[PDB]
Amino acid sequence: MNTDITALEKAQYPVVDRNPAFTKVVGNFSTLDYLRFSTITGISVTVGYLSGIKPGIKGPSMVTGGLIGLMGGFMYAYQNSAGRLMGFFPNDGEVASYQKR
Amino acid sequence: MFNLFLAVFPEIFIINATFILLIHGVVFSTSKKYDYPPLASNVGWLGLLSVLITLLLLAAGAPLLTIAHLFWNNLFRRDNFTYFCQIFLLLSTAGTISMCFDFFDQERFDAFEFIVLILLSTCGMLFMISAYDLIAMYLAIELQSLCFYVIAASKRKSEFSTEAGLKYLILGAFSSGILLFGCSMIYGSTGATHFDQLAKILTGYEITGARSSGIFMGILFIAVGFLFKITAVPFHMWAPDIYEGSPTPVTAFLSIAPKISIFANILRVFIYGSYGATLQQIFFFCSIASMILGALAAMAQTKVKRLLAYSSIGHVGYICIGFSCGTIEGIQSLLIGIFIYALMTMDAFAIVLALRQTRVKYIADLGALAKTNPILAITFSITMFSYAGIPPLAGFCSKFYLFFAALGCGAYFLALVGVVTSVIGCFYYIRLVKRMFFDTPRTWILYEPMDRNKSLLLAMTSFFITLFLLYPSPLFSVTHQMALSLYL
Amino acid sequence: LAQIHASENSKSFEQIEVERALRKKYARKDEDYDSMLGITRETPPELILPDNVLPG
Amino acid sequence: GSKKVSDRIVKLSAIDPDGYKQDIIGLSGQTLLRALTHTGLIDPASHRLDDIEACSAECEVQIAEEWLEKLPPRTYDEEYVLKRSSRSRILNKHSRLGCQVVLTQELQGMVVAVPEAKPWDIP
Amino acid sequence: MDLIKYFTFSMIIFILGIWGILLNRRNILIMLMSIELMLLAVNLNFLVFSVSLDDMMGQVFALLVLTVAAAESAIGLAIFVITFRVRGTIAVEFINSIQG
Amino acid sequence: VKVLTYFGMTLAAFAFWQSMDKVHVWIALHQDEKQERMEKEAEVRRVRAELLRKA
Amino acid sequence: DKGAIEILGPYGISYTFRRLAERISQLQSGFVYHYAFAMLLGLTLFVTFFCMWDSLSSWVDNRLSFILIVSSFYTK
Amino acid sequence: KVSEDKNRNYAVVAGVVAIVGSIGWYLKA
Amino acid sequence: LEHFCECYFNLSGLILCPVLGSIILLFIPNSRIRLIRLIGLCASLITFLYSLVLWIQFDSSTAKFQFVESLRWLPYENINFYLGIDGISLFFVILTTFLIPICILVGWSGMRSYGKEYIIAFLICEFLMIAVFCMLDLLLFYVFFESVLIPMFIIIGVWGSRQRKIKAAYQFFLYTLLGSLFMLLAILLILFQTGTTDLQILLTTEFSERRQIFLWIAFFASFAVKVPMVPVHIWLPEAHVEAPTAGSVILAGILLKFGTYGFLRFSIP
Amino acid sequence: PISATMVGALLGLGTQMYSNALRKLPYMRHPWEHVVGMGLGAVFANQLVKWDVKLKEDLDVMLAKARAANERRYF
């Protein structure tokens, strides 16, 4: 399979890594990424609990909401971290860490 | 490899969440221990959450949706136009879902599969917006259509719901076959199905004497399918029967989202492609027919749902006038009309769903509403006057553009038709206001107050309708942006 | 009539709450979805009045 | 008390779709539909107003010509509603919209046939 | 003459589907069958063009269209079944209550 | 239908398709005349357009 | 005031538009066959007018086209 | 002395985490 | 270009007065009938005094528009709208502000059943009509004239005496809307030439005799319905008779003047 | 003066009250919700103003490219 990461709209910030590996993107998670992750997961668990009370399955509903929130929050944090490493999002921290290591 | 899939993060998330909700619903709906709880509202809340997370993922990752565009090129095409169209589609789906909880619990519609089918149809419409090939367009349209067929027949013991489903499936399948035939003719004549290839082949020739009758009839058949989808006359008569016979939340959902998706498709196929004046004439004649028939038939209606269906037919005529004139302002006006009509329809169906708790059916059932719920009667009156296009309400934009294009493209029969149909529409819209405010019936119907979700949605849409023309700049700028992004 | 009124007026807080929840659960129905599930929901006996007070 | 409800009561008989005859009661000045809804012969929820604008022939009844002469003739709107509500789109000559028939003392003893109920509860 | 003969075969199938819609006003099952006939004709159109043009796109889409035809028939026959169950009959006079 | 009825309908259809073949041959044989008519009409239209543009 | 102007005004306009809305509503007959037939007729009209209107101009005119369409309203 | 509903306690923790994480999200952005 | 005036009493505040009255009355319970009555009456009276002051500072020597002020609509500033009066519109503003308190006073005795909706409708009418008389722009003249149709429709339909008010209100709305749509067509016709709807500019552009004839016909379509001129006068007896007393007062005393004002303000010059 | 924060706060408060009224509840039934609505309205109005500015900025560049492409014709 031939691949090509090249985007239609070029990056407006310095490109620290054109096609960062999965584990590199995850290790690039910042405090703000974890805050987004945790907030999305917590809101999802809360919605699961509250919507589960009337059917009587608040626990399992919490688990289902938490799974949805975990997947969505991880995808959002990955989106942000990868976009920063690729230069699509403001990436002052990535540039600073890159100019030193 | 993984980073290539950043272009489809929104769709991956919503599909996976839909699968999770399907499994959750089927596992606990069958539970003896939990006494087979109804899960329509639980799954509905979780699916509203999923839609909102999808919206977040899509809106916050605007550049990333264009990543790896060469790798994805033969599958879809994401740009600014698709960006905004998909955001609007997700917002409409979220609002429609939020309007469904009172219906779930009070009717006791316990089927959670309803929510799953709505989510899968939303997936289909998302793929419709980004389609850039006849094959992908057809597949996404079919996914959307099959989901609607199933949900239109969801009240499976009702004569009305089963009738709606049967009519929908037969007429939908017929129109889809016609569209597929058109696609086959175009492929056979050009050797291409990708929109870029079609643009290159068809540009510069239109009808240069030696015109490909294969190309000309493929376009015609595809246009017939599209016109069926937008409920344009004479391919419209499915719409009033389906709208009335389906469960009211289904009717609300069908009234908005498919129009957005199919108009995105129409823009990117025709506007971006090239046979030309023939097709703009198609939409011109269908617009005039839709305005006239919608006005007259709506004037005939005694029931609320049928009135709203015919009103939507007339308004798609008004909107297609913009597509017909073939200018950047035409596209912009079409988009503005779609947005404003969607918000007004959401307002109207929030009221209708609120009143369905006491089984509203006839216009006359609204009698004395200005006495039994004054603020509700005023809110509904603002919606009607906006539908009529009375300034300074938001609905005035569509009327203003209709006449602007009539004097811009140079069409005076169109202006005459617009004047007459606007006056007819105003009559049958203010008839509702008369029923709520002027009539003194012997027997009144007292309506149960609406839930919080519908009250909040109604409150926001009512401020928008009254106050949009005070600050209309963001919509104007975003729609101009989208119109330009179709070609650049 | 005195029997049903005496029975209701002497209920404790816990039983009042239990019957409030039961009344809410059985106030409406979806018999079509029950038939799809192959179950039949029955009204609990604490919500059924004796026959000697019914109109028939 | 020199003015009783018995002064306005109109004796009526209704034949249900199964064919069985029932003796029913209504007030003079009120509609035949109201009298029929008193005992549930017609579902009151299916026809809540006595207005032609809120009618899909849920109130439709069949009356023999001996009692039809004692009623006012059907208006154009009534025949329109009856014909369009017919499954075969045929106007029955003995069909009356129950919501448009006002009971009077002259209708004492009228016999009315109630046809099978049409679907009415739009999703 | 091969390509005109292959195309007119599929064309007669499509016209037969249209005629089946036109001639079956009391028989909506045959109307569904006529719609399948049209879908078959379109599928044949894609396959013939693929060979004539020496291109694979017609063949990929033909397979996917077969999937759509299958799902369409399944859902349509379910809707037919429930309509029949509600009414006890398939006659068209019992599916005409929505009007106007 | 009767089996013989189906066979006879098949024979009639075979005759119809052979007639269609003759029609296709006719259409192919008249490509040149149609092209000539198209060219003469194109020349007439171009001459009219050039002449009217002179004013 | 109450005569010709009413007839050539609100009284007459209301009557004719009521009858026209009446007629248009009856088109929505409730029969799925009518709806399919309408789609077929619209498709046939599309092909006929927009592609097979090349040699027709010899025998026809646009005036007669629109006249016969309006004249159809006064039938039976 | 003690709230015994474990699922309720977990939901309380989730709501608190959502609130505090939202505050931090605003503050650090 | 910001055309902000220097005088303290200006047009925008006189616009805002009945608006603020209506918002306040939106939230006061119908049980507080005395408070509703007094608040509406006082708002209308203050507006009347404000208009009297505007008369005081009028300059009767200039042919220009006085107290001209501007209101931006878009940051692009392509479309920017102006308010101003002259010696032809001043007394109509005064007449509107004077008649509205009269309308509130006529229904004083029945206000317990009229409710706050009556006063709110009349205040909204006042705001819209003052706006109409104060507009230096064809398009905004259009938008604010059509807006009065909604509260006038409500006034006739709700507080009319008998069931003929139904037909009267329908006819009023439909006749007036037909005329308004004709003048919208004229407005767009003008905009295509000029690229603007600002009255001051149109007073300094030259229109061809032909297109002057046709634009004048399009303006006449609205204005003759408004005046009314025969034979489009038949809506007036029905509407002015079936309306409540104050509704008839507003219809005859102010709304009728809008057609002649349109003739004086756009068609003749 | 009339800032986006104030317009938004007023709109949010009005939204809560309108919602209460639609449900036939007292205007101030749950006052903490009125506070929440004022906050959300202020936030939404400020964000809308910023988004409007950004939208005009993007439309400017896009119109510039359209104009350049059109002007390429006369070369």
Ligand SMILES: CCCCCCCCCCCCCCCCCC(=O)OC[C@H](COP(=O)([O-])OCC(O)COP(=O)([O-])OC[C@@H](COC(=O)CCCCCCCCCCCCCCCCC)OC(=O)CCCCCCCCCCCCCCCCC)OC(=O)CCCCCCCCCCCCCCCCC
């Ligand atoms: C080099 C080649 C050499 C070839 C040599 C062979 C040439 C044969 C020529 C024959 C023609 C002359 C006949 C002279 C008269 C004969 C005397 C006579 O008629 O008495 C017979 C007498 C009935 O005669 P009748 O008085 O006319 O009564 C007729 C009806 O009763 C009347 O009642 P009705 O009016 O109510 O009608 C109801 C309907 C009954 O309802 C039906 O639907 C009829 C059935 C049609 C569909 C059934 C198959 C689909 C069902 C699935 C089956 C499994 C599928 C998978 C397996 C097969 C696929 C390979 O009846 C019919 O419509 C019958 C019409 C027959 C059409 C189908 C046969 C044609 C198939 C195509 C043949 C292709 C080659 C021949 C053409 C060559 C080019 C010209 O009894 C019999 O026929 C004996 C029954 C055994 C028949 C076996 C036939 C094969 C069955 C299995 C295979 C199924 C698939 C078919 C082949 C598929 C190919 C891929």
Ligand SMILES: CCCCCCCCCCCCCCCCCC(=O)OC[C@H](COP(=O)([O-])OCC(O)COP(=O)([O-])OC[C@@H](COC(=O)CCCCCCCCCCCCCCCCC)OC(=O)CCCCCCCCCCCCCCCCC)OC(=O)CCCCCCCCCCCCCCCCC
């Ligand atoms: C020299 C060798 C000599 C030795 C060999 C001789 C071999 C014997 C001769 C071959 C067989 C011929 C005789 C057939 C059986 C007659 C005996 C009999 O008992 O029939 C009873 C039969 C009663 O029907 P049934 O079978 O008992 O079924 C009763 C129920 O219908 C059953 O219910 P159902 O549900 O099953 O079916 C429903 C419905 C079924 O509905 C239908 O089937 C529709 C009926 C109308 C058919 C329309 C034409 C279809 C054929 C296609 C043709 C091209 C169409 C193109 C259209 C697209 C273009 C846009 O039923 C019907 O409507 C039955 C109507 C049957 C009438 C068939 C008439 C066919 C048209 C003939 C036109 C002739 C024009 C010639 C030139 C053609 C242009 C090239 O009554 C008849 O006598 C009619 C059949 C006789 C005429 C048909 C055969 C025509 C063959 C002509 C010779 C070939 C000429 C071309 C040669 C080319 C050489 C190069």
Ligand SMILES: CCCCCCCCCCCCCCCCCC(=O)O[C@@H](COC(=O)CCCCCCCCCCCCCCC)COP(=O)(O)OCC[N+](C)(C)C
């Ligand atoms: C000028 C526009 C163009 C023309 C169109 C006009 C459209 C309207 C037609 C005008 C004719 C008269 C209309 C009468 C309506 C006035 C009466 C009214 O609506 O009062 C409502 C008031 O309706 C509202 O709630 C309106 C709220 C909208 C909020 C808009 C203001 C936004 C900022 C305000 C901030 C909050 C208040 C600040 C001061 C406390 C009372 O509703 P009820 O159903 O009677 O009872 C409600 C229940 N309860 C009182 C117990 C709460």
Ligand SMILES: CCCCCCCCCCCCCCCCCC(=O)O[C@@H](COC(=O)CCCCCCCCCCCCCCC)COP(=O)(O)OCC[N+](C)(C)C
């Ligand atoms: C002495 C100074 C400190 C004062 C502190 C005052 C701060 C209060 C601020 C108000 C917060 C309002 C939060 C609104 C959400 C309501 C949360 C709630 O209702 O708790 C519920 C549900 O809780 C949740 O599911 C998640 C939300 C809880 C998180 C917020 C709790 C607010 C206080 C924080 C307490 C935890 C702090 C310590 C954590 C270790 C308890 O469970 P159930 O009884 O089963 O719920 C029944 C359904 N119903 C919601 C209608 C009541």
Ligand SMILES: CCCCCCCCCCCCCCCCCCCC(=O)O[C@H](COC(=O)CCCCCCCCCCCCCC)COP(=O)(O)OCCN
């Ligand atoms: C633009 C013009 C001007 C607009 C002004 C906007 C100003 C901002 C809005 C301010 C809002 C003021 C009110 C804030 C406090 C209300 C908080 C709601 C609390 C809540 O949890 O509500 C729950 C329900 O969810 C809900 O009710 C919320 C969902 C309701 C729908 C909201 C939209 C969701 C989907 C998005 C649609 C977008 C459409 C666009 C096409 C439970 O409520 P409960 O406890 O009372 O119990 C209900 C019985 N089940």
Ligand SMILES: CCCCCCCCCCCCCCCCCCCC(=O)O[C@H](COC(=O)CCCCCCCCCCCCCC)COP(=O)(O)OCCN
């Ligand atoms: C050179 C000489 C030129 C002369 C100048 C000509 C200028 C135009 C002059 C004519 C002006 C006509 C304006 C229309 C007024 C119609 C008012 C009728 C409304 C009415 O009174 O009652 C309604 C009539 O029924 C209805 O159903 C009415 C339906 C609505 C009809 C509105 C159609 C007007 C469209 C414009 C036509 C004129 C075009 C001009 C280019 C409602 O009665 P109901 O009881 O049935 O309803 C259910 C009740 N809740």
Ligand SMILES: COC1=C(OC)C(=O)C(C/C=C(\C)CC/C=C(\C)CC/C=C(/C)CC/C=C(\C)CCC=C(C)C)=C(C)C1=O
């Ligand atoms: C009151 O008298 C009567 C009629 O007269 C109104 C009738 O008709 C009929 C019966 C015949 C009919 C209805 C045939 C008409 C059917 C048509 C034209 C099929 C198309 C369907 C629709 C809904 C028309 C929509 C198409 C339009 C408006 C134009 C097409 C499209 C464009 C120009 C773009 C009867 C019995 C009748 O008693």
Ligand SMILES: [Fe+3]
């Ligand atoms: Fe009735």
